């Protein structure tokens, strides 16, 4: 398994330990490259049969003007540092982030590396399995995966590998603090785009050297 360079997978029941191993080796792929890597992979690959974790996050908080928003982050952030995964406060599984950090990510909102979307828009959307047909119009799909092209790309692969219904999952993380969760992409068992999973526990990263 090489992704142009040598690529090892990094599992642990302690997320911080897994990420730390991954970062000692090389660097962990964020969700866009994680997704692509799967698209490049052929039937039989552990990339297709194991669920996977990315240091990408889904964060919920307030803009300076105090509007609730959800942002999907595919760059280095507070929760892609293992020491923070260990030590930050957790509220229903989500890690607490500094207001400064959440606002720094808000300002990086292009629609390419960081996607900001409206809280009510996600909260009114489904959390669960839906036909691939309806996937792309779901508020999570495109920011989650990182681009409309890439998302339609993966949905293609998805129909071929996992089938005709996809899991798009999320929960309500609007609380008195900014809250982040690392993103998971499922397998045959755990199906789809998983953004309601708690931090600190099971994780499987992909590192490249
Ligand atoms: Mg632990
Ligand atoms: Mg805080």
Residue numbers in the entry: 2 to 210
Quoted passage from the original study:
The structure of AvpA was determined by single-wavelength anomalous dispersion (SAD) from selenomethionine-labeled AvpA and refined to 2.52 Å resolution limit. The electron density calculated from SAD phases enabled residues 2–210 of AvpA to be traced, while electron density for residues 211–256 was absent, most likely due to the flexibility of this region. The structure of AvpA revealed a single globular domain that has a CLec-fold. Thus, while AvpA clearly has a CLec-fold, it is only distantly related to Mtd and TvpA, and likely represents a new subclass of the CLec-fold. In between these strands are other characteristic features of DGR CLec-fold proteins, such as two α-helices (α1 and α2) that are roughly perpendicular to each other, and a four-stranded, anti-parallel β-sheet (β2β3β4β4’), part of which forms the ligand-binding site. The variable region of AvpA (residues 181–203) is located close to but not at the very C-terminus of the protein, as it is for Mtd and TvpA. A major difference is that the variable residues of AvpA do not occur until the end of the β4’ strand, whereas variable residues are found as early as the β3 strand or just after the β3 strand for TvpA and Mtd, respectively. AvpA has two inserts not seen in Mtd and TvpA: Insert 3 (residues 89–114) between β3 and β4, which is composed of loops and two α-helices; and insert 4 (residues 120–179) between β4 and β4’, which is composed of a more complicated arrangement of α-helices and two antiparallel β-strands. In the case of AvpA, both inserts 2 and 4 make hydrogen bonds to the main chain of the VR, with the majority of contacts coming from insert 2.
Diversity-generating retroelements (DGRs) create massive sequence variation (1012-20) in select proteins. The archaeal DGRs have in common the genetic elements identified in bacterial DGRs. This includes a variable region (VR) that is located within the coding region of a variable protein, a template region (TR) that is similar (~90 % typically) but not identical to the VR and located in a proximal noncoding region, and a reverse transcriptase (RT). Thus, a hallmark of DGRs is the substitution of adenines in the TR by other bases in the VR, resulting in protein coding variation. The results presented here on one of these, AvpA, revealed a remarkable conservation in archaea of the CLec-fold for accommodation of massive sequence variation.
